[model samples]
Target: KVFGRCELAAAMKRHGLDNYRGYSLGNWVCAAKFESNFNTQATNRNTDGSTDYGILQINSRWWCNDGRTPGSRNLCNIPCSALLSSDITASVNCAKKIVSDGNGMNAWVAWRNRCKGTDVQAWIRGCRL
Candidate 1:
């Protein structure tokens, strides 16, 4: 489920991430670039026993119900496996919920460390959107 940079940017924009919560299209693209390398199947396990899933690397402990994390809240009310699909609609919708929950882009440290305060415009370079 790997996507090209431009392709990924367009998808994110189409799904309403553009200017979402004062974050630009490039912001989401850049964050995804660093978080999952544009690969929907990307995942990472945290030391606290939580796992991040899909393109946004959404956390299993808070956002999705993996049925494994000890105290998962399933805030997103979705199965974590849904985020791993190449379609990306589920991941995008969940990401919107994350921001709407008031976490902002800061929910992902990868965005703060890499995309935040950086020139993210280049991330969408050559994209039609």
Candidate 2:
């Protein structure tokens, strides 16, 4: 899996996230690990029966179906899957927008804190590539 670093950078920049050093790839990787385990094609059926699809686990059926809300295509004019087909940065940016209001880094910080005192990187290390 060849991760596109430039694409990731562009995605981050699109979301007004210019600070990459503080937001390391390891941090992004960790978020991706928790969010969808780095599965670009992953999807989840929520307990309430809603579906979250793709790398960020975006609920396309809900988000893009009616296209009325923030993540809605009629509102944001971008399909939910567009975030997933690319690198983690795109999804991260969208998550920042949808869930964090451009404060996605804060969400990442919270996720890191939640994973504290454990080998959070273990999952990535265990992968055989």
The candidate that achieves the highest TM-score relative to the unseen native structure: 1
Model 2: per-residue lDDT, tens digit, 67-118? 3333434223456566557455555555545544455445444355655345
Residue pairs of candidate 1 with colliding backbone atoms? none
For model 1, how does the per-residue alpha-carbon lDDT over 1-129 read when each residue is reduced to its tens digit? 899999998888889889988899999989998999999999899999999999999999899998889978898899999999999999999999998887699998999898889999999878787
TM-score, cand. 1 vs. native: 0.96
lDDT of each model, Cα atoms only? 0.91, 0.50
Worst 10 residues of 1 by lDDT: 99-108
* Model 2, residue pairs in steric clash: none
Q: Runs in model 1 with CA error above 4 Å?
A: none
The TM-scores of all predictions, comma-separated, are 0.96, 0.49
Alpha-carbon shift of residue 42 in model 2 (angstroms): 0.6
Measured with C-alpha atoms, the lDDT of residue 15 in candidate 2 is 53
